[PDB]
Amino acid sequence: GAFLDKPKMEKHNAQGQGNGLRYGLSSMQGWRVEMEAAHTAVIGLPSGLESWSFFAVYDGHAGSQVAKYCCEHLLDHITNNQDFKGSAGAPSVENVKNGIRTGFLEIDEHMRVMSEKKHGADRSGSTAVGVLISPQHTYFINCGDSRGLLCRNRKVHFFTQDHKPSNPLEKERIQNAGGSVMIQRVNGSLAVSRALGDFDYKCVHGKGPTEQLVSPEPEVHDIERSEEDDQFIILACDGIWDVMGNEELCDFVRSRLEVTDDLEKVCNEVVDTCLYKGSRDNMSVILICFPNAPKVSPEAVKKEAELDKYLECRVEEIIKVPDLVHVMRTLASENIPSLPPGGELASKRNVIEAVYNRLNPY
Ligand SMILES: [Mn+2]
Protein backbone atom coordinates (compact mmCIF):
# COMPACT_ATOMS: atom_id res chain seq x y z
CA GLY A 1 0.00 0.00 0.00
CA ALA A 2 1.17 3.55 0.56
CA PHE A 3 3.96 4.42 2.96
CA LEU A 4 6.95 6.26 1.63
CA ASP A 5 10.31 5.08 2.93
CA LYS A 6 10.45 8.46 4.71
CA PRO A 7 7.63 10.91 5.42
CA LYS A 8 7.07 14.01 3.26
CA MET A 9 7.33 16.79 5.85
CA GLU A 10 6.55 19.70 3.53
CA LYS A 11 3.90 22.02 4.99
CA HIS A 12 1.29 23.70 2.90
CA ASN A 13 0.24 26.77 4.89
CA ALA A 14 -2.26 29.60 4.61
CA GLN A 15 -3.42 32.36 6.93
CA GLY A 16 -5.83 35.28 6.93
CA GLN A 17 -7.82 37.71 9.03
CA GLY A 18 -11.13 39.56 8.85
CA ASN A 19 -14.52 39.81 10.52
CA GLY A 20 -12.77 39.79 13.86
CA LEU A 21 -11.21 36.40 13.08
CA ARG A 22 -7.64 35.21 12.51
CA TYR A 23 -6.78 31.78 11.11
CA GLY A 24 -3.87 29.57 10.12
CA LEU A 25 -3.82 26.13 8.57
CA SER A 26 -1.36 23.41 7.72
CA SER A 27 -1.55 20.26 5.63
CA MET A 28 1.12 17.59 5.26
CA GLN A 29 1.32 14.37 3.30
CA GLY A 30 3.37 12.59 5.97
CA TRP A 31 4.00 8.83 5.55
CA ARG A 32 1.41 8.29 2.77
CA VAL A 33 2.39 7.88 -0.85
CA GLU A 34 -0.54 10.01 -1.88
CA MET A 35 -1.91 13.31 -0.69
CA GLU A 36 -5.67 13.26 -0.53
CA ALA A 37 -6.56 16.12 1.82
CA ALA A 38 -8.21 19.45 0.96
CA HIS A 39 -9.55 22.48 2.78
CA THR A 40 -11.64 25.63 2.41
CA ALA A 41 -10.88 28.85 4.24
CA VAL A 42 -12.79 32.02 3.39
CA ILE A 43 -13.61 35.14 5.33
CA GLY A 44 -16.45 37.06 3.72
CA LEU A 45 -19.02 35.12 1.70
CA PRO A 46 -20.75 36.45 -1.43
CA SER A 47 -24.39 37.43 -1.97
CA GLY A 48 -24.85 39.51 1.18
CA LEU A 49 -22.94 37.26 3.54
CA GLU A 50 -19.85 39.34 3.79
CA SER A 51 -19.95 39.22 7.55
CA TRP A 52 -19.84 35.42 7.38
CA SER A 53 -16.91 33.04 7.13
CA PHE A 54 -16.45 29.37 6.26
CA PHE A 55 -13.75 26.86 7.08
CA ALA A 56 -13.64 23.16 6.26
CA VAL A 57 -11.29 20.17 6.17
CA TYR A 58 -11.87 17.33 3.68
CA ASP A 59 -10.22 13.95 4.17
CA GLY A 60 -10.22 12.17 0.81
CA HIS A 61 -10.13 8.38 0.36
CA ALA A 62 -9.53 6.26 -2.77
CA GLY A 63 -8.47 9.44 -4.55
CA SER A 64 -8.48 13.20 -4.13
CA GLN A 65 -11.11 14.02 -6.76
CA VAL A 66 -14.11 14.27 -4.44
CA ALA A 67 -12.26 16.17 -1.71
CA LYS A 68 -10.98 18.62 -4.32
CA TYR A 69 -14.38 19.31 -5.85
CA CYS A 70 -15.90 19.79 -2.37
CA CYS A 71 -13.21 22.21 -1.22
CA GLU A 72 -13.98 24.44 -4.18
CA HIS A 73 -17.76 24.04 -4.43
CA LEU A 74 -19.37 22.79 -1.23
CA LEU A 75 -19.87 26.34 0.04
CA ASP A 76 -21.76 27.52 -3.03
CA HIS A 77 -23.93 24.40 -3.03
CA ILE A 78 -24.80 25.21 0.59
CA THR A 79 -25.54 28.93 0.14
CA ASN A 80 -27.11 28.79 -3.35
CA ASN A 81 -30.13 26.61 -2.71
CA GLN A 82 -33.71 27.56 -1.88
CA ASP A 83 -33.53 26.06 1.60
CA PHE A 84 -30.62 28.23 2.71
CA LYS A 85 -32.13 31.28 1.05
CA GLY A 86 -35.58 30.89 2.59
CA SER A 87 -37.14 33.30 3.46
CA ALA A 88 -37.17 36.96 4.47
CA GLY A 89 -34.00 38.95 5.04
CA ALA A 90 -31.16 36.93 6.54
CA PRO A 91 -31.46 33.14 6.92
CA SER A 92 -33.00 31.71 10.08
CA VAL A 93 -31.19 28.99 12.00
CA GLU A 94 -33.54 26.50 10.33
CA ASN A 95 -32.71 27.96 6.87
CA VAL A 96 -29.01 27.53 7.62
CA LYS A 97 -29.35 23.94 8.83
CA ASN A 98 -31.69 22.79 6.03
CA GLY A 99 -29.54 24.72 3.56
CA ILE A 100 -26.45 22.87 4.69
CA ARG A 101 -28.27 19.55 4.44
CA THR A 102 -29.57 20.35 0.97
CA GLY A 103 -26.12 21.49 -0.16
CA PHE A 104 -24.56 18.18 0.88
CA LEU A 105 -27.24 16.10 -0.84
CA GLU A 106 -27.10 18.24 -3.96
CA ILE A 107 -23.32 18.36 -4.41
CA ASP A 108 -23.27 14.58 -3.91
CA GLU A 109 -25.84 14.05 -6.68
CA HIS A 110 -24.09 16.71 -8.79
CA MET A 111 -20.79 14.80 -8.62
CA ARG A 112 -22.63 11.57 -9.34
CA VAL A 113 -24.13 12.96 -12.56
CA MET A 114 -20.81 14.50 -13.66
CA SER A 115 -19.09 11.15 -13.16
CA GLU A 116 -21.76 9.14 -15.00
CA LYS A 117 -21.76 11.61 -17.88
CA LYS A 118 -17.96 11.64 -18.25
CA HIS A 119 -17.48 7.94 -17.42
CA GLY A 120 -15.31 8.86 -14.41
CA ALA A 121 -12.85 6.16 -13.37
CA ASP A 122 -12.19 7.27 -9.81
CA ARG A 123 -14.07 5.74 -6.93
CA SER A 124 -13.03 8.33 -4.36
CA GLY A 125 -14.94 9.79 -1.41
CA SER A 126 -14.34 12.40 1.29
CA THR A 127 -15.24 13.37 4.79
CA ALA A 128 -16.07 16.99 5.50
CA VAL A 129 -15.89 18.87 8.77
CA GLY A 130 -16.35 22.60 9.03
CA VAL A 131 -17.85 25.69 10.58
CA LEU A 132 -20.00 28.37 9.03
CA ILE A 133 -19.53 31.45 11.18
CA SER A 134 -22.10 34.26 11.19
CA PRO A 135 -22.08 37.40 13.33
CA GLN A 136 -24.12 35.65 16.00
CA HIS A 137 -23.64 31.89 15.48
CA THR A 138 -21.07 29.21 14.79
CA TYR A 139 -22.66 26.35 12.84
CA PHE A 140 -20.60 23.17 13.14
CA ILE A 141 -20.92 20.78 10.23
CA ASN A 142 -19.82 17.15 10.22
CA CYS A 143 -20.00 14.32 7.70
CA GLY A 144 -17.55 11.51 8.46
CA ASP A 145 -14.69 10.92 10.87
CA SER A 146 -12.93 14.24 10.63
CA ARG A 147 -13.67 16.34 13.74
CA GLY A 148 -14.00 19.91 14.95
CA LEU A 149 -14.12 21.53 18.34
CA LEU A 150 -14.69 24.87 19.98
CA CYS A 151 -12.66 26.09 22.94
CA ARG A 152 -14.54 28.52 25.17
CA ASN A 153 -13.21 29.74 28.51
CA ARG A 154 -10.23 27.35 28.31
CA LYS A 155 -12.46 24.29 27.97
CA VAL A 156 -13.79 22.06 25.20
CA HIS A 157 -17.25 23.63 24.82
CA PHE A 158 -18.34 21.47 21.89
CA PHE A 159 -16.92 18.82 19.55
CA THR A 160 -18.39 16.95 16.61
CA GLN A 161 -19.33 13.29 16.98
CA ASP A 162 -17.43 11.08 14.50
CA HIS A 163 -19.56 9.05 12.08
CA LYS A 164 -18.38 5.44 12.47
CA PRO A 165 -20.14 2.37 11.01
CA SER A 166 -20.25 0.70 14.44
CA ASN A 167 -22.28 3.59 15.89
CA PRO A 168 -25.76 2.18 16.69
CA LEU A 169 -27.80 4.35 14.30
CA GLU A 170 -25.20 4.02 11.54
CA LYS A 171 -25.06 0.25 11.95
CA GLU A 172 -28.85 0.18 11.74
CA ARG A 173 -28.99 2.13 8.48
CA ILE A 174 -26.22 -0.01 7.00
CA GLN A 175 -27.97 -3.25 7.94
CA ASN A 176 -31.32 -1.99 6.61
CA ALA A 177 -29.50 -1.24 3.36
CA GLY A 178 -28.60 -4.91 3.03
CA GLY A 179 -25.06 -4.45 4.29
CA SER A 180 -23.08 -5.40 7.38
CA VAL A 181 -20.58 -3.85 9.79
CA MET A 182 -17.56 -6.09 10.23
CA ILE A 183 -15.52 -4.83 13.16
CA GLN A 184 -15.42 -1.13 12.20
CA ARG A 185 -15.92 -1.37 8.44
CA VAL A 186 -18.89 -1.33 6.09
CA ASN A 187 -18.94 -4.78 4.48
CA GLY A 188 -15.39 -5.07 5.82
CA SER A 189 -14.04 -2.27 3.61
CA LEU A 190 -14.96 1.30 4.53
CA ALA A 191 -14.17 2.75 7.95
CA VAL A 192 -16.66 5.62 7.64
CA SER A 193 -20.43 5.58 7.51
CA ARG A 194 -20.84 9.07 6.05
CA ALA A 195 -19.06 10.76 3.17
CA LEU A 196 -19.52 12.57 -0.10
CA GLY A 197 -18.71 10.33 -3.08
CA ASP A 198 -18.23 6.58 -2.52
CA PHE A 199 -21.01 6.08 -5.06
CA ASP A 200 -20.49 2.30 -5.20
CA TYR A 201 -21.96 2.37 -1.70
CA LYS A 202 -24.98 4.43 -2.73
CA CYS A 203 -26.63 2.03 -5.16
CA VAL A 204 -29.29 0.42 -2.99
CA HIS A 205 -32.68 0.25 -4.72
CA GLY A 206 -35.72 1.16 -2.65
CA LYS A 207 -33.78 3.38 -0.28
CA GLY A 208 -33.39 7.16 -0.41
CA PRO A 209 -30.08 9.10 -0.65
CA THR A 210 -29.75 9.23 3.15
CA GLU A 211 -30.67 5.56 3.62
CA GLN A 212 -27.76 4.11 1.60
CA LEU A 213 -24.77 2.12 2.92
CA VAL A 214 -22.84 5.38 3.13
CA SER A 215 -24.77 8.58 3.79
CA PRO A 216 -23.95 12.11 2.58
CA GLU A 217 -26.17 13.61 5.31
CA PRO A 218 -24.26 16.10 7.54
CA GLU A 219 -24.87 16.73 11.21
CA VAL A 220 -25.19 20.43 12.04
CA HIS A 221 -25.09 22.20 15.39
CA ASP A 222 -25.77 25.85 16.07
CA ILE A 223 -23.74 27.41 18.86
CA GLU A 224 -24.60 31.00 19.82
CA ARG A 225 -21.37 32.98 19.83
CA SER A 226 -19.90 34.50 22.96
CA GLU A 227 -17.65 37.46 22.18
CA GLU A 228 -16.24 37.32 25.72
CA ASP A 229 -15.59 33.61 26.10
CA ASP A 230 -15.09 32.12 22.59
CA GLN A 231 -11.37 31.40 22.16
CA PHE A 232 -10.69 29.21 19.13
CA ILE A 233 -11.92 26.45 16.84
CA ILE A 234 -9.87 23.51 15.62
CA LEU A 235 -10.81 21.55 12.51
CA ALA A 236 -8.72 18.44 11.67
CA CYS A 237 -8.79 15.03 9.94
CA ASP A 238 -8.44 11.73 11.78
CA GLY A 239 -4.71 11.95 11.04
CA ILE A 240 -4.62 14.31 14.01
CA TRP A 241 -7.39 12.90 16.20
CA ASP A 242 -6.10 9.29 15.96
CA VAL A 243 -3.21 10.35 18.23
CA MET A 244 -4.45 13.36 20.23
CA GLY A 245 -7.67 13.60 22.26
CA ASN A 246 -9.98 16.62 22.49
CA GLU A 247 -8.74 17.91 25.81
CA GLU A 248 -5.08 17.20 25.00
CA LEU A 249 -5.11 19.08 21.72
CA CYS A 250 -7.07 21.97 23.18
CA ASP A 251 -4.54 22.23 26.06
CA PHE A 252 -1.64 21.90 23.61
CA VAL A 253 -2.90 24.56 21.24
CA ARG A 254 -3.39 26.93 24.15
CA SER A 255 0.15 26.34 25.30
CA ARG A 256 1.43 27.19 21.80
CA LEU A 257 -0.74 30.32 21.53
CA GLU A 258 0.80 31.56 24.77
CA VAL A 259 4.18 31.43 23.02
CA THR A 260 3.36 32.73 19.54
CA ASP A 261 0.53 34.39 17.58
CA ASP A 262 1.78 32.96 14.28
CA LEU A 263 -1.13 30.62 13.54
CA GLU A 264 0.62 28.77 10.71
CA LYS A 265 3.44 27.96 13.09
CA VAL A 266 0.98 26.63 15.68
CA CYS A 267 -0.66 24.45 13.02
CA ASN A 268 2.76 23.16 11.90
CA GLU A 269 3.54 22.34 15.54
CA VAL A 270 0.32 20.33 15.82
CA VAL A 271 1.02 18.41 12.60
CA ASP A 272 4.65 17.56 13.46
CA THR A 273 3.66 16.59 16.97
CA CYS A 274 1.05 14.16 15.64
CA LEU A 275 3.57 12.70 13.18
CA TYR A 276 6.01 12.18 16.07
CA LYS A 277 3.28 10.52 18.15
CA GLY A 278 3.02 7.95 15.38
CA SER A 279 0.40 9.20 12.95
CA ARG A 280 1.05 7.68 9.51
CA ASP A 281 -1.82 9.41 7.68
CA ASN A 282 -2.15 12.66 5.74
CA MET A 283 -2.78 15.48 8.24
CA SER A 284 -4.70 18.75 7.90
CA VAL A 285 -5.61 21.26 10.59
CA ILE A 286 -7.26 24.67 10.59
CA LEU A 287 -6.97 26.92 13.65
CA ILE A 288 -9.48 29.81 13.81
CA CYS A 289 -8.91 32.32 16.61
CA PHE A 290 -11.54 34.72 17.97
CA PRO A 291 -10.66 38.08 19.60
CA ASN A 292 -10.35 36.56 23.08
CA ALA A 293 -8.13 33.64 22.10
CA PRO A 294 -5.19 33.28 24.48
CA LYS A 295 -2.51 35.96 24.06
CA VAL A 296 1.27 35.59 23.96
CA SER A 297 2.59 35.55 27.56
CA PRO A 298 6.07 36.87 28.40
CA GLU A 299 6.38 34.24 31.12
CA ALA A 300 5.33 31.42 28.75
CA VAL A 301 7.87 32.63 26.21
CA LYS A 302 10.58 32.59 28.90
CA LYS A 303 9.63 29.12 30.08
CA GLU A 304 9.80 27.86 26.49
CA ALA A 305 13.31 29.31 26.06
CA GLU A 306 14.38 27.79 29.38
CA LEU A 307 13.03 24.39 28.36
CA ASP A 308 14.70 24.55 24.95
CA LYS A 309 18.07 25.38 26.56
CA TYR A 310 17.58 22.60 29.09
CA LEU A 311 16.85 20.09 26.33
CA GLU A 312 19.91 21.27 24.40
CA CYS A 313 22.12 20.65 27.44
CA ARG A 314 20.64 17.20 28.02
CA VAL A 315 21.35 16.19 24.44
CA GLU A 316 24.95 17.40 24.66
CA GLU A 317 25.48 15.28 27.77
CA ILE A 318 23.59 12.17 26.65
CA ILE A 319 25.86 12.24 23.58
CA LYS A 320 28.57 10.90 25.93
CA VAL A 321 27.27 7.84 19.67
CA PRO A 322 23.57 7.04 20.21
CA ASP A 323 21.17 7.62 17.31
CA LEU A 324 18.28 10.09 17.64
CA VAL A 325 15.84 7.32 18.56
CA HIS A 326 18.04 6.35 21.48
CA VAL A 327 18.42 9.94 22.60
CA MET A 328 14.65 10.42 22.55
CA ARG A 329 14.36 7.19 24.55
CA THR A 330 16.78 8.44 27.21
CA LEU A 331 15.06 11.83 27.41
CA ALA A 332 11.73 10.07 27.86
CA SER A 333 13.14 7.99 30.74
CA GLU A 334 14.23 11.15 32.55
CA ASN A 335 10.60 12.25 33.02
CA ILE A 336 11.39 15.90 32.19
CA PRO A 337 8.98 18.36 33.87
CA SER A 338 7.17 21.26 32.22
CA LEU A 339 6.79 19.73 28.77
CA PRO A 340 3.87 21.13 26.72
CA PRO A 341 0.55 19.72 27.93
CA GLY A 342 -0.85 17.17 25.51
CA GLY A 343 2.13 17.58 23.18
CA GLU A 344 4.65 16.16 25.63
CA LEU A 345 8.15 15.10 24.46
CA ALA A 346 6.92 14.51 20.89
CA SER A 347 6.12 18.23 20.66
CA LYS A 348 9.74 19.01 21.52
CA ARG A 349 11.30 16.58 19.01
CA ASN A 350 12.03 19.35 16.49
CA VAL A 351 14.10 21.22 19.10
CA ILE A 352 15.87 17.99 20.16
CA GLU A 353 16.62 16.91 16.59
CA ALA A 354 18.01 20.32 15.65
CA VAL A 355 20.57 20.17 18.48
CA TYR A 356 21.34 16.52 17.76
CA ASN A 357 21.99 17.46 14.12
CA ARG A 358 24.41 20.23 15.09
CA LEU A 359 26.36 17.75 17.24
CA ASN A 360 26.23 14.75 14.88
CA PRO A 361 25.78 16.25 11.41
CA TYR A 362 26.98 13.12 9.58
MN1 LIG B 1 -7.31 10.36 7.28
Smallest CA-to-CA distance from 326 within 334, 318, 338 is with: 318
Phi, psi dihedral angles at 8 (to 5 degrees): -80, 110
Phi, psi dihedral angles at 289 (to 5 degrees): -100, 135
Method: X-ray
CATH of the domain at 35: 3.60.40.10
Whether residue 190 sits in one domain with residue 335: no
Q: How distant is the alpha carbon of residue 295 from its chain centre?
A: 23
Whether residue 323 sits in one domain with residue 195: no
Sign of the dihedral through C-alpha 39, 34, 127, 249: negative
Whether residue 216 sits in one domain with residue 70: yes
Whether residue 63 sits in one domain with residue 140: yes
Please give the Cα distance from 255 to 215 (Å, whole number). Answer: 37
Resolution, rounded to a tenth of an Å? 2.0
What is the whole-number distance in angstroms between the Cα of residue 16 and the centre of ligand 1? Answer: 25
Please give the Cα distance from 156 to 77 (Å, whole number). Answer: 30
Q: Which helix (H) or strand (E) holds 77?
A: helix 65-79
Smallest CA-to-CA distance from 37 within 64, 13, 56 is with: 64
Whether residue 96 sits in one domain with residue 189: yes
**DSSP label at 232?**
E
- Under a CB-based contact definition with an 8 Å cutoff, are residues 192 and 144 in contact? yes
242 marked ligand binding residue = no
Q: Which domain holds residue 330?
A: 295-362
Smallest CA-to-CA distance from 177 within 200, 160, 161 is with: 200
Type of residue at 145: D
120 marked ligand binding residue = no
CATH of the domain at 310: 1.10.10.430
Number of folded domains in the chain? 2
Whether residue 299 sits in one domain with residue 270: no
Q: Which helix (H) or strand (E) holds 54?
A: strand 53-61
Whether residue 232 sits in one domain with residue 152: yes
Give the DSSP per-residue string, 283-344: EEEEEEE-TTSPPP-HHHHHHHHHHHHHHHHHHHHH-----HHHHHHHHHHTT-SSPPTTTT
Whether residue 324 sits in one domain with residue 287: no
Whether residue 172 sits in one domain with residue 32: yes
Q: 278, 294, 310: which is the final residue of a domain?
A: 294
Type of residue at 73: H
Length of the chain counted residue by residue: 362
Backbone conformation region of residue 28, classed left if phi is above 0, alpha if psi is from -120 to 50, else beta: beta
What is the whole-number distance in angstroms between the Cα of residue 142 and the centre of ligand 1? Answer: 15
Whether residue 102 sits in one domain with residue 183: yes
User: Quick one: 351 exposed, middle or buried, by C-beta within 10 A (0-12, 13-18, 19+)?
Assistant: middle
